[PDB]
Amino acid sequence: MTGAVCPGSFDPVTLGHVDIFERAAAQFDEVVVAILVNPAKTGMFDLDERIAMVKESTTHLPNLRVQVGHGLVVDFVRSCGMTAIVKGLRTGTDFEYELQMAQMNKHIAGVDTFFVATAPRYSFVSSSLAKEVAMLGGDVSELLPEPVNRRLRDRLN
Amino acid sequence: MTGAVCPGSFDPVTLGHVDIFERAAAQFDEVVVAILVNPAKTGMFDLDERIAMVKESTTHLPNLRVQVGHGLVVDFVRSCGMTAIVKGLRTGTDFEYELQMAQMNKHIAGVDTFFVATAPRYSFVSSSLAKEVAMLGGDVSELLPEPVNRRLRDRLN
Amino acid sequence: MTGAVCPGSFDPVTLGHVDIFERAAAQFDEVVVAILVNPAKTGMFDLDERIAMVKESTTHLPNLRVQVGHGLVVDFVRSCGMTAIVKGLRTGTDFEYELQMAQMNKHIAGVDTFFVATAPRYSFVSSSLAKEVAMLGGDVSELLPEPVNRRLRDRLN
Amino acid sequence: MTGAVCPGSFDPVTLGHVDIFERAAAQFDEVVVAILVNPAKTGMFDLDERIAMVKESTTHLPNLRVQVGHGLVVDFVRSCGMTAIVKGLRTGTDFEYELQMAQMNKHIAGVDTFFVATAPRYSFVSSSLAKEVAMLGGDVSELLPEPVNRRLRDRLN
Amino acid sequence: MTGAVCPGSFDPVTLGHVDIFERAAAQFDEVVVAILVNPAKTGMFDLDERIAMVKESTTHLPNLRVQVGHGLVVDFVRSCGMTAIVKGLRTGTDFEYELQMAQMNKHIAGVDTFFVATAPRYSFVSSSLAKEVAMLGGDVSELLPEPVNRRLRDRLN
Amino acid sequence: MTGAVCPGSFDPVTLGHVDIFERAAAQFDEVVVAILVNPAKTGMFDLDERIAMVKESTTHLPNLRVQVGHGLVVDFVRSCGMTAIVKGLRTGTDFEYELQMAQMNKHIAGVDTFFVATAPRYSFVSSSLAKEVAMLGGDVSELLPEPVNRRLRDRLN
Ligand SMILES: CC(C)(COP(=O)(O)OP(=O)(O)OC[C@H]1O[C@@H](n2cnc3c(N)ncnc32)[C@H](O)[C@@H]1OP(=O)(O)O)[C@@H](O)C(=O)NCCC(=O)NCCS
Ligand SMILES: CC(C)(COP(=O)(O)OP(=O)(O)OC[C@H]1O[C@@H](n2cnc3c(N)ncnc32)[C@H](O)[C@@H]1OP(=O)(O)O)[C@@H](O)C(=O)NCCC(=O)NCCS
Ligand SMILES: CC(C)(COP(=O)(O)OP(=O)(O)OC[C@H]1O[C@@H](n2cnc3c(N)ncnc32)[C@H](O)[C@@H]1OP(=O)(O)O)[C@@H](O)C(=O)NCCC(=O)NCCS
Ligand SMILES: CC(C)(COP(=O)(O)OP(=O)(O)OC[C@H]1O[C@@H](n2cnc3c(N)ncnc32)[C@H](O)[C@@H]1OP(=O)(O)O)[C@@H](O)C(=O)NCCC(=O)NCCS
Ligand SMILES: CC(C)(COP(=O)(O)OP(=O)(O)OC[C@H]1O[C@@H](n2cnc3c(N)ncnc32)[C@H](O)[C@@H]1OP(=O)(O)O)[C@@H](O)C(=O)NCCC(=O)NCCS
Ligand SMILES: CC(C)(COP(=O)(O)OP(=O)(O)OC[C@H]1O[C@@H](n2cnc3c(N)ncnc32)[C@H](O)[C@@H]1OP(=O)(O)O)[C@@H](O)C(=O)NCCC(=O)NCCS
């Protein structure tokens, strides 16, 4: 009964996120994707849309499920009966801040954090940058699941 | 008559800050903790509370005093008759930005900046992260002075 | 017919920027400085003032011209009939984010990004830090073109 | 079913290494410690003493075994029926390198690498630094397991 | 009129090196690949094979030539009638060093250095890692040009 | 009463080292330059010439003395009646390492390490790079004190 949580805001989910989902799914018996929305920061997609996009991109992963989190990621992790977090690393990641959170999460709840480097082809995509480029007419279709592409296309007119 | 200034917003002061205060105090004849509040950014604690918390955490350091700064840190430093700043380094610190400020401060006023690594046990605490975790019910009591813990507890109800 | 674009918000232009302009100008047949203003973020100087300051600082560079960009930097680059961007590196630069943008820009439009380290004397100046120090009465005159200094002086009273 | 390999030269094993072994053992069904032989550049302890030191230091982890490797780490991993490497991060880790190896290992054999931050109290110990300090008379006994301390003090008397 | 030098030991040349050659050849009138001889620390291939490998791998770039250098890279650059060095950035690059050399080269001869990020698919290959993996039986043929692969498989049979 | 140790191999001392000596001498009552002997890996200048070079380059600092050390830097520091090390940061510094040593030195003897950024004009010089360039005929005389320049030009004629 091994398990890991993949936390994030996923606004929207990218192929960078999916690559990490797939690696977590391959190495742990169970994997929970936790969508932790910021109560102060409203992004582009609403919670239901973010859930849909994640679920639409992870139908091929039987041991993975999507779930909404509130408050501490470690509280969510423990409520799943798990003690592990898996985080992706890419080009631009604030790794020092990821390390700070990792140590903090370990300190407050005994939760381990495992970092894994995203595949090179998906190493420069992030949610905020994909949105920025897309909303200015740039083609990021290869850097996002097709369901996400369909929805970004809907917001052109 | 050697002296160093430890500048910051201290909202709230952490055991990371105190560790740096103690090391500065051990190496310099006089040490001034400068609380430089951001006029645009309002945090959690008001200036009086921030002063109180710093003073409540530094009663054991005879050659240290707490003082409020306005404008340039270098203007505050020079007004204390000093030419040195001591800054802490921890897990997550934007060190490139600390370096930029250090060079700038040296350029504009001839003020030296000394960096020192915080003790490992207090290396992942920061004011903003401690607040975030605490306000979601997380236990950061070991990562803050007891007086600070008492005040964070008061803001639960 | 070689060419490079030097993009930025230049609010205001610094001697760090100029140093990069000069190096780009020395190595490419044509060089276009693209002023890409953020539609969400309003800074200190208006677009006309930013253009003036850049033009006032680059009269000595015959193969360089100043032009306003809208939307994607790569769209601006391609519209100049170019395939290259030149970016400066200094003390504090978020290099991981510069790398992310570089890879992204290459992916979406085949545009190459060339990075060059600014001269050490101008390695700690940035637009935001120069403004912060100046508006608190600090002397950054050596870290900015004289025309920029004149304008920063006008906003004291 | 799940498994991870913890590779290294372990000359000698530190409490930093053991911390990582413990994290891996808690999150995977099986952990294999792979002791890989370095080039002409040989070390203080021979292979048998290295094996024994790791073994005596990990008696509290029943799902962990120790094994020598002679070629590619990925070949070792695959021959064990696994597809994951777990590696520790400490102060002084060459991350740039670790990431290069991770990407290379993923490319040549499809093996994933997971990185974990070592506990702060054990974040500054490394085999080479421990050896250097110990040989010069310094006390690193709190940073190494007792089986290592025993063999270390026998070498210096 | 415009020109760039791409310096290195190229032992052997990788598809990471070639990617950079291609970027330079597209943006400058002339590119010179400078093969500089390392100290006593010699390598796998001799100078003539190194030259031939670079030559056979760059037949698709008519504005590129290959030349041996024996002293300072800046002396090579200047003797070629140029003032620019182009260097690739990959996962595992010692940037801290590259920047030091860039500043030193600028100081001693006024030579500019331009950095370019290698294509993601070729971002984890380096000469030394490719050699290590190949000698241990791993397949790095997708990361090296065929002229290098040919000479590499002849050395291991 | 206050004191700092500036440790190194100083082979040879650079104007980067001297900048740091000057910062330390201005902020502490006493500064001791500790010349520590490296392992089998010996250098260009012998110990006596190294001592003399540091001495002749620091005549303008009356509160600074020079002394050889043979073991742990912390043992040197403590035997001098001090508890502080001052170390310079330059372009190309291995910070990751410096921090590891700082934490280790604090752990084994309670000695604090203070880091200071070298002046920009002297931020790219290091002993090894200066030696490399000088031996190849390059002019590094502006980056080294004249006592070093004298002994350097006598070695190359
Ligand atoms: C959910 C959580 C893991 C963040 O997930 P996320 O939003 O998907 O994280 P991302 O991958 O998008 O990147 C982090 C974002 O924070 C920002 N960030 C980066 N460095 C930062 C730093 N030093 N300080 C604050 N924010 C930072 C970045 O802008 C980044 O967004 P962007 O790069 O896309 O513009 C985190 O907020 C969390 O755990 N929330 C629950 C509350 C909690 O437990 N907090 C305590 C953590 S110890
Ligand atoms: C007081 C001063 C030293 C900052 O102190 P501080 O607020 O305690 O600094 P902190 O330790 O909290 O960390 C810096 C904060 O700035 C932010 N920061 C980090 N990198 C940054 C960067 N690249 N650019 C802008 N802000 C940055 C961070 O969010 C961090 O807060 P957080 O990590 O807790 O979320 C500085 O603002 C100052 O000197 N103010 C006086 C005005 C002045 O002299 N300015 C000129 C400086 S050259
Ligand atoms: C114009 C452009 C190159 C930015 O230029 P710029 O504003 O002059 O950049 P700067 O040199 O001032 O520095 C970048 C700023 O972004 C911020 N920044 C730094 N790291 C960041 C990160 N990780 N994520 C988001 N913003 C970041 C910094 O605050 C910095 O400002 P500051 O350091 O002065 O406070 C970029 O916004 C752009 O290309 N815009 C056009 C739209 C586009 O093409 N976007 C797609 C890029 S792939
Ligand atoms: C065994 C292996 C994981 C290394 O483990 P290790 O020796 O315990 O690793 P450590 O972190 O203790 O030490 C790494 C050492 O290499 C050095 N290292 C760091 N950066 C390096 C670089 N750029 N190039 C080469 N070595 C580097 C460090 O100096 C460090 O030694 P130190 O303790 O003296 O600092 C690895 O060498 C390996 O996989 N070997 C098997 C062969 C193989 O698979 N090769 C191809 C891998 S893609
Ligand atoms: C030729 C030259 C550009 C180097 O090229 P190169 O060998 O292809 O460079 P690479 O990136 O492949 O390798 C750099 C190597 O040096 C090492 N390097 C990295 N950091 C270093 C450091 N701090 N100090 C010394 N070498 C370092 C790396 O370990 C790397 O080797 P690797 O592949 O085993 O990792 C350079 O040495 C040069 O200019 N030589 C001519 C002489 C000269 O001009 N000297 C003064 C320069 S300011
Ligand atoms: C003397 C001492 C401070 C080093 O000083 P130094 O030689 O002048 O330091 P420098 O910055 O000039 O050089 C550091 C060198 O080590 C190397 N260094 C950097 N990273 C390293 C690493 N990961 N592992 C080992 N050495 C490293 C660098 O390559 C650099 O050499 P360079 O100029 O060729 O780049 C240190 O070795 C010391 O304290 N010695 C005394 C013994 C002791 O106390 N040991 C335990 C310390 S915790």
Q: Which of D10, D32, D36 to mutate to test the pocket of ligand 4 (most atoms within 8 A of CB)?
A: D36
Pocket test for ligand 3, best of C94, C101, C105, C140 (most atoms within 8 A of CB): C94
Element (H, E) at D89: strand D84-89
Q: Is the dihedral of CA F91, F97, F99, F105 positive or negative?
A: negative
What is the C-alpha separation between E48 and D30, in angstroms, rounded?
Answer: 50
Experimental approach was X-ray
Cis peptide before F12 (omega within 30 of 0): yes
CB A116 within 8 A of CB A98: no
Q: What is the DSSP string of E59-105?
A: TT-TTEEEEEE-S-HHHHHHHTT--EEEEEE-TT--HHHHHHHHHHH
- DSSP class per residue in C18-62: HHHHHHHHHHSSEEEEEE---SS---SS-HHHHHHHHHHH-TT-T
Binding residues of F for ATP: 9-10, 17, 88-90, 98, 122-128
**Percentages of chain D per state (helix, strand, coil), in multiples of 5:** 45, 20, 35
Biggest alpha carbon distance in chain B?
48
Please give, rounded to a whole number of angstroms, the shortest distance from the CA of C47 to a CA of chain E.
29
Residue F31 · residue F25 · CB < 8 Å: yes
Enumerate the domain spans of chain E: 1-157
Give the Cα separation of D21 and D118 in Å (integer): 10
Nearest 5°: the CA angle D64, D10, F40 is 175
- 3-class DSSP state of E48: helix
From F102, F116, F120, residue closest to B117, measured CB to CB:
F102
Q: What's the token pair of residue A46?
A: 């609403």
Could you count the other beta carbons within 10 Å of the beta carbon of residue A38?
9
Angle between helices A15-27 and A47-57 (to 10 degrees): 60
Give the distance, in angstroms, between the CA of residue A42 and the centroid of all CA atoms in the same chain.
Answer: 17
User: Rounded distance, CA A84 to CA A112, Å?
Assistant: 5
Taking alpha carbons only, the member of E24, E109, E43 closest to residue E72 is E109
| Resolution value (Å, 1 decimal) | 2.1
Tokens for B44, please give them.
């959690």
CA of D12 to the centre of ligand 4 (A): 14
Contact F145, F18 (CB under 8 A): yes
How would you label F42-63 residue by residue, b for 16+ Cβ within 10 Å and e otherwise? ebbbeeeebbebbeebbeebee
Q: Per the CB < 8 Å rule, is A92 touching C107?
A: no
Amino acid making up residue F22: E
Distance of alpha carbon B70 from alpha carbon B67, whole angstroms: 10
Report the gap between the CA of D143 and the closest CA in chain F (Å).
10
Catalytic one among D17, D23, D50, D131?
D17
CA of E62 to the centre of ligand 5 (A): 27
DSSP result, F56-97? HT-TT-TTEEEEEE-S-HHHHHHHTT--EEEEEE-TT--HHH
Closest ligand relative to A101 C-alpha: 1
- Chain F residues with CB under 8 Å of D143 CB are 107
Q: Are strands C64-68 and C30-35 parallel, antiparallel or unpaired?
A: parallel
**Burial class for B105, CB neighbours closer than 10 Å (0-12, 13-18, 19+):** buried
Written in H, E and C, the secondary structure of chain A is CCEEEEEECCCCCCHHHHHHHHHHHHHCCEEEEEECCCCCCCCCCCHHHHHHHHHHHCCCCCCEEEEECCCCHHHHHHHCCCCEEEEEECCCCCHHHHHHHHHHHHHHHCCEEEEEECCHHHCCCCHHHHHHHHCCCCCCHHHCCHHHHHHHHHCCC
Q: Indicate which residue of C50, C57, C127, C151 is catalytic.
A: C127
Alpha carbon separation from A55 to A4, A27, A32, E88, F72 (Å, rounded):
17, 20, 12, 39, 58
Q: For the domain B1-157, what is the CATH code?
A: 3.40.50.620
- Find how far residue F50's CA is from the centre of its chain: 10
**Strand (E) positions, chain C?**
3-8, 30-35, 64-68, 84-89, 112-117
Residues of A with a catalytic annotation lie at 17, 41, 90, 127
For residue F93, give how far its alpha carbon lies from the nearest alpha carbon of chain D (Å): 12
| Angle (nearest 5°) at CA D25 between D19 and D28 | 135
**How many Å is the Cα radius of gyration of chain D?**
15
Tokens of E15: 């598809």
Residue D34 main-chain phi, psi, to 5 deg? -100, 115
Helix (H) or strand (E) holding D112: strand D112-117
Q: Is C114 annotated as a binding residue?
A: no
Compute the distance from residue F122 Cα to the ligand 3 centre, in Å.
Answer: 29
- C-alpha Rg value of chain E to the nearest Å: 15
Coil, strand or helix at C107? helix
Q: How far is CA B124 from the centre of its chain?
A: 15
**Measured distance CA(A51)–CA(B109) in Å, rounded:** 53
| 8 Å CB contact between E114 and E85 | yes
Strand partners, B8: B35
Q: Which residues contact F83 (CB under 8 A, 6 or more apart)?
A: B26, B27, F77, F110, F111, F112
> Residue E145 is encoded by which pair of tokens?
């040009």
Q: D48 Cβ partners below 8 Å, 6+ apart?
A: none
Ligand 4 atom closest to residue D72's alpha carbon, by position in its atom list: 44
Answer yes or no: do E137 and D104 touch at CB < 8 A: no
In order of B83, F36, F113, the CA distances from F100 in angstroms are 28, 18, 11
Query: Number of CB pairs < 8 Å for C and F?
Result: 9
Rounded Cα distance between A52 and A56, Å, is 6
CB of C47 closer than 6 angstroms to any ligand 3 atom: no
A125 is in an annotated binding site: yes
Q: How far is it, in rounded angstroms, from Cα C140 to Cα C119?
A: 16
Atom of ligand 5 nearest to the CA of E129: 33
Whats the size of chain F, residue-wise?
A: 157
Give the list of residues 6+ apart from residue E45 with CB closer than 8 angstroms, or none: E11, E12, E53, E151
- In this structure, are strands D30-36 and D64-69 parallel, antiparallel, or unpaired? parallel
Q: How many residues does chain D have?
A: 157
What is the sign of the dihedral through the CA atoms of B114, B115, B119 and B124?
A: positive
Contact C103 A91 (CB under 8 A): yes
Report the gap between the CA of A46 and the closest CA in chain C (Å): 21
In contact, E15 and E123? CB cutoff 8 Å:
no
| DSSP secondary structure, D139-153, as one string | --GGGS-HHHHHHHH
- When scoring C89, C91, C93, C142 by the number of chain F Cβ atoms within 10 A, the one with the most, hence best to mutate, is C91
Which atom belonging to ligand 6 lies closest to the Cα atom of F87? 3
Diameter over CA atoms, chain A: 48
User: Which residue type occupies E117?
Assistant: A
User: What are the Cα distances from residue B76, in Å, to A93, B41, B62, B72?
Assistant: 35, 20, 20, 7
- Provide the CA C51 distance to its chain's centre, in angstroms: 11
Residues B113, B114, B118, B123: what is their CA dihedral angle, to the nearest 10 degrees? 40
In the numeric block, which tokens belong to residue F9? Answer: 């191999």
E116 three-state secondary structure: strand
> B30-35 and A30-35: which strand pairing?
unpaired
Considering Cα of C80, then C82, then C83, then C88, what sign does the dihedral take? negative
Mutation site for B-interface testing, chosen from A104, A106, A111, A115 by largest number of B Cβ within 10 Å: A104
Asked if C96 contacts C40 with a C-beta cutoff of 8 angstroms, the reply is: no
Report the alpha-carbon distance of residue E99 to residue C80 in Å, rounded. Answer: 30
Q: Which ligand is nearest to the CA of B71?
A: 2
Give the distance from residue C99's alpha carbon to the nearest chain B alpha carbon, in angstroms. 16
Q: Can you say which residues of D are annotated as belonging to the binding site for ATP?
A: 9-10, 17, 88-90, 98, 122-128
Distance, CA B121 to ligand 1 centroid (Å)?
A: 23
> Measured in angstroms, how far is the CA atom of residue F44 from the centroid of ligand 5?
20
Residue among C23, C50, C57, C90 flagged as catalytic: C90
- What token pair was written down for B157? 């109800």
C-alpha distances (whole Å) from B52 to each of B21, B31, B35, C56, F45 are 15, 17, 11, 50, 56
Alpha-carbon dihedral sign for residues C54, C55, C61, C62: positive
Q: What are the structure tokens assigned to D156, written together?
A: 């210096």
The angle formed by the CA atoms of residues C51, C56 and C58, to the nearest 5 degrees, is: 95
Closest CA to B49 of B70, B35, B31, B69: B35
B10-40: b (≥16 Cβ within 10 Å) or e: bbbbbbbbbbbbbbbbebbebbbbbbbbeee
Gapped junctions in chain A, after residues (C–N > 2.5 Å): none
Question: Using CA atoms, how far apart are residues B81 and B76, in angstroms rounded to an integer?
Answer: 9
Chains C and D touch (3+ CB pairs under 8 A): no
Phi, psi of D99 (to 5 degrees): -65, -40
Q: Is B123 in the pocket of ligand 2 (CB under 6 A)?
A: no
| Cα–Cα dist E146/E124, whole Å | 18
Ramachandran angles phi, psi of A64, nearest 5°: -110, 140
Chain E residues with beta carbon closer than 8 angstroms to that of F140: 108
Alpha-carbon gap, residue D123 to F102, rounded angstroms: 12
What is the separation of C-alpha A3 from the centre of its chain, rounded to a whole number of angstroms? 16
Element containing residue E52 per DSSP (H, E): helix E47-57
Indicate which atom in ligand 6 lies nearest the CA of residue F69.
41
Burial F17-36 (b: 16+ CB within 10 A, else e): bbbbbbbbbebbebbbbbbb
Residues 6+ apart with CB under 8 A from D46: none
> What residues in B contact D124, CB-CB < 8 Å?
120
DSSP assignment, residue C124?
Answer: S
Alpha carbons F60 and F145: distance in angstroms, whole number: 12
Tell me the β-bridge partners of D31: D4, D64
Instruction: Give phi and psi for F94, each to the nearest 5.
Output: -80, 85
Check: CB of residue B47 under 8 Å from CB of residue B35: yes
CA C109: distance to chain centroid?
Answer: 21
Give me Rg for the CA atoms of chain F. Answer: 15
Q: How many CA atoms lie within 13 A of E69 on its CB side?
A: 25
Exposure string of C77-87, with b = 16+ CB inside 10 Å and e = fewer, is: beebebbbbbb
Is the four-CA dihedral A85, A89, A92, A98 of positive or negative sign? Answer: positive
Report how far residue D68's alpha carbon sits from residue D101's, in angstroms, rounded to the nearest whole number: 20
Rounded CA separation B155/B148 (Å): 11
